Symmetry: D2
Subunit: 266 residues, 4 copies
């Protein structure tokens, strides 16, 4: 008789786990994750902010890169998240323990983060990571300020119920740069139509496409750089082919509409 | 350059995942886990109790065996735990969702269960499972009653800070049978001496050896059946060579004292 | 020198704490709360459901009324909530401990319930109650079924971020009765315009007015009976003057628009 | 017919809420609470530590006193607790939100803190406060270090299951001062004998008396200053009549033994 199957680990492409040196996005914003996973460090006078952290095993690499930027572990004051999946919020638990930073997230992301990604509406328990607790609950449009830099949350439910875009204004060449960190708009293997765990899934994606179009957006970044056409490996040319917020939302909606029709035919 | 390592899954010996039919221990107590992982079902007039559930992937098998015993999913009223490691408390989250049962545990096991086993004092994040919440906090010596069957908790810290033994009185051949479900007394790969995460580790193990000796104990069971010399596969002869509570505690202390001396010499 | 002020208790009108006998709403739906606080019991073949529980001190009275209906404590399987304020979700913690029932709520209500109502966006810590944990997270439009009776959740954010309406179909005189339990639409003392803790507060109220209008609604009930023109004290004539769902939403929007203009002028 | 009783607020003697200016205990240790509630600030080069915070309404006063000591809100790095009752851990939730400090506590205190003091083993829901989460779980004897100052936890269960004494070495007149912050040893209105919620209550108190006797103790402080014979109001003479650790434990045990005999006779 066959035994019950062994637990399967969440494996990803090697480029998602390929460390990279800090890549400057603007005067205070740096990509410090891996080549295929975004992790943004915003350095203020009163401490540092981290948006996403990638996979669980990236915690040490993030702290190494923070130190290359002159940010001691205890100088990290705040962790912000796009959504609480293992490949974006993986190391949050370990980062909280080692930095003393607080996590700000909306209620849906907080509840998912507190489950460690277990009981996913679409993936079940296949992408579990160490759970972490949110210290501040964020509402739609709420402003989070660290060192005088205002971060504004824009709810874009879909990929996860708590999917959030974060916008803030940096500088470059003495001119303002409105950075938009928009969450994923994919639905990989999701059941879209008549989903009992997510009955309004299609309506949420539709409004989220419109939300992404209206974001203040001089420079767009996404948790997966390829989604917005970044290439973190080519250095100072990484952002050359980056999409607008309008192009990102439009490309996402056509892929969504094609998958929706394919689901009807499958 | 080498990428960061992929996540490693918690793999175990095949016999830990080998399903078995319900094996009767006493008039109301059944082993319904696998051949090498204990999961005890106690059936009362007012519902069923489950002590431990084994690995995360055993949830369906447990519910199948409960149904073979005539226990519908919603008839499970209470889940009790020896300790909150992935191979004993793995399926607790899924069982709560599908049965409506409550979990009773002490504070140390509840805090570990709420982390999904992450941030283990000795194993780090290597044995993470879906986290679950305790509905009732139990003190040492406290009695938990379901259907008129009294379960008494005996704290035996060591293997985990929350390690607990559960005792209750069943019947067999019209005579009382005092069953003792004692937790693991192993320290596999632990640092025993001068452990900053567990400074009183040795003192706790010592008192726990004495606690196990004094348990009301006509029949001893352990989360790993081989620890108490059970053999779930040979059917009605499974308990023939089972150890006493005194023999279990004594065998454990000698292994502990030998490992302690080996640690001094290693 | 004056000392710091003593803690102030959450006091309410006496009629909110005036016990009443079970009042039948339909074949399986009963009001079992107080004269001015709704607490609905739906009795199925496979257990009972409770929607709201009123104040913290109502826990014993609810269990007394459940027993008058023939519902033993352990027969309560599910607790549903309009919103997690002290006067509607007060006794949830005690009810879970004594009945083994599970709580189903959306993420916003779960996070507020887990704080015991502390850190309210508008009331601060003035209405704290014993906190409780949600066992199942509910999405908008999701169906929750107990004993074959389907409960559908309709998010109506505003009074609280997690404010929810619950709809289900009962019977009476052999004919179907579509009951709508709609949450509060008041904003008592709220700052509506430019609220940093709730920047989209006005937009949420507006959509919630439209959501209430579109509910399947043969009979409307609200957490405060006077909001829908019930009078629980006059017995079998309690529902005579009850409002429609359209009249409730319209009366609420005019009060909201008048308060919004008064806020501009105050 | 009488209505259900209104909620009763946790009121205390005025002196528990009488603010006081910072009173220096040693080179880096200050009493910054009220006249009858201890709240200790330890200032290091790398941030500040707070042991206990008193009542919920003391949060603002604590931050005012921290600022008088030159400690900005975000400079508070760690909150430590004797036990999680409303008059000692009241403002922890608000302090975390406004300072970004982490809370370190054992599992029993963390579980009680997470309930906001509700479901007390002896007081029920009479002393509920805003709940807070522990960021680091502490074991017995574990060392917590901030700015090079080592804090050692000594479990003394009794007053609460998680009751903890904190010891550290400060300086004064160039000589070391071993400060012991020992928790309460009272059992006000407790049922000591055969308590189903706390069956080993008497054994825990007995061991805790011995634990307090053996503490490194040049200067003893307690959460209630009168328990160790401090008088915070008389300024630089506040510690003149302070008890030793041995005298405190002995005075507590005689009061405990007299109450135990009175309980047998009552
Ligand atoms: C579109 C993608 C690419 O896939 C990742 C995702 C889905 O969110 N899935 C995966 O990593 C795998 C996949 O989708 O095949 C996977 C592997 C194992 C498993 O059990 C579940 C999923 O991350 C969880 N994220 C995005 C995004 O846009 O964010
Ligand atoms: C003495 C044992 C045998 O090992 C299991 C244990 C340790 O508790 N470890 C393991 O399963 C593995 C092992 O110990 O080698 C393991 C594998 C991977 C890993 O990352 C960590 C541990 O269960 C977690 N339990 C007991 C017990 O007496 O309960
Ligand atoms: C419109 C009302 C009437 O008031 C209650 C409310 C507000 O939600 N407030 C109160 O009970 C008091 C009030 O509003 O004056 C109060 C008293 C003390 C306090 O610290 C805060 C509020 O319940 C919390 N609920 C509704 C509802 O529609 O649900
Ligand atoms: C010995 C005392 C004095 O009382 C406080 C206590 C008990 O811990 N109780 C009280 O404050 C009141 C009392 O004991 O009468 C009280 C008031 C209302 C209530 O509902 C419960 C208790 O704090 C909770 N602490 C200690 C200690 O040694 O720490
Ligand atoms: Cu994702
Ligand atoms: Cu992803
Ligand atoms: Cu183990
Ligand atoms: Cu094991
Ligand atoms: Cu309300
Ligand atoms: Cu109300
Ligand atoms: Cu106390
Ligand atoms: Cu006290």
């Amino acid at each position: 008789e066959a035994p019950l199957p062994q637990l399967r680990a969440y494996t990803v492409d090697a480029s998602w786990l390929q460390p990279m040196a800090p890549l400057q996005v603007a005067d205070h914003t740096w990509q410090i994750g891996t080549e295929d996973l975004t992790a943004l460090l915003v350095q203020t006078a009163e401490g540092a902010v981290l948006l996403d952290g990638g996979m669980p095993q990236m915690a040490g690499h993030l702290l190494d890169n923070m130190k290359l930027r002159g940010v001691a572990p205890q100088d990290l004051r705040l962790i912000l998240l796009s959504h609480a999946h293992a490949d974006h919020a993986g190391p949050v638990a370990e980062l909280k323990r080692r930095t003393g930073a607080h996590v700000a997230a909306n209620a849906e992301t907080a509840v998912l983060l507190a489950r460690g990604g277990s009981n996913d509406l679409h993936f079940g328990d296949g992408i579990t990571y160490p759970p972490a607790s949110a210290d501040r609950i964020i509402m739609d449009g709420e402003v989070v300020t660290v060192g005088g830099i205002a971060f504004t949350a824009h709810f874009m439910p879909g990929h996860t119920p708590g999917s959030t875009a974060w916008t803030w204004t940096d500088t470059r060449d003495g001119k303002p740069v409105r950075i938009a960190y928009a969450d994923s708009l994919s639905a990989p293997g999701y059941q879209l139509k008549g989903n009992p765990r997510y009955p309004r899934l299609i309506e949420d994606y539709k409004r989220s496409f419109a939300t992404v179009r209206a974001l203040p957006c001089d420079l767009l970044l996404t948790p997966h750089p390829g989604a917005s056409n970044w290439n973190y490996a080519v250095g100072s040319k990484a952002s050359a082919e980056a999409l607008t917020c309008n192009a990102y939302a439009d490309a996402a909606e056509k892929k969504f509409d094609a998958q929706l029709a394919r689901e009807t035919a499958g």
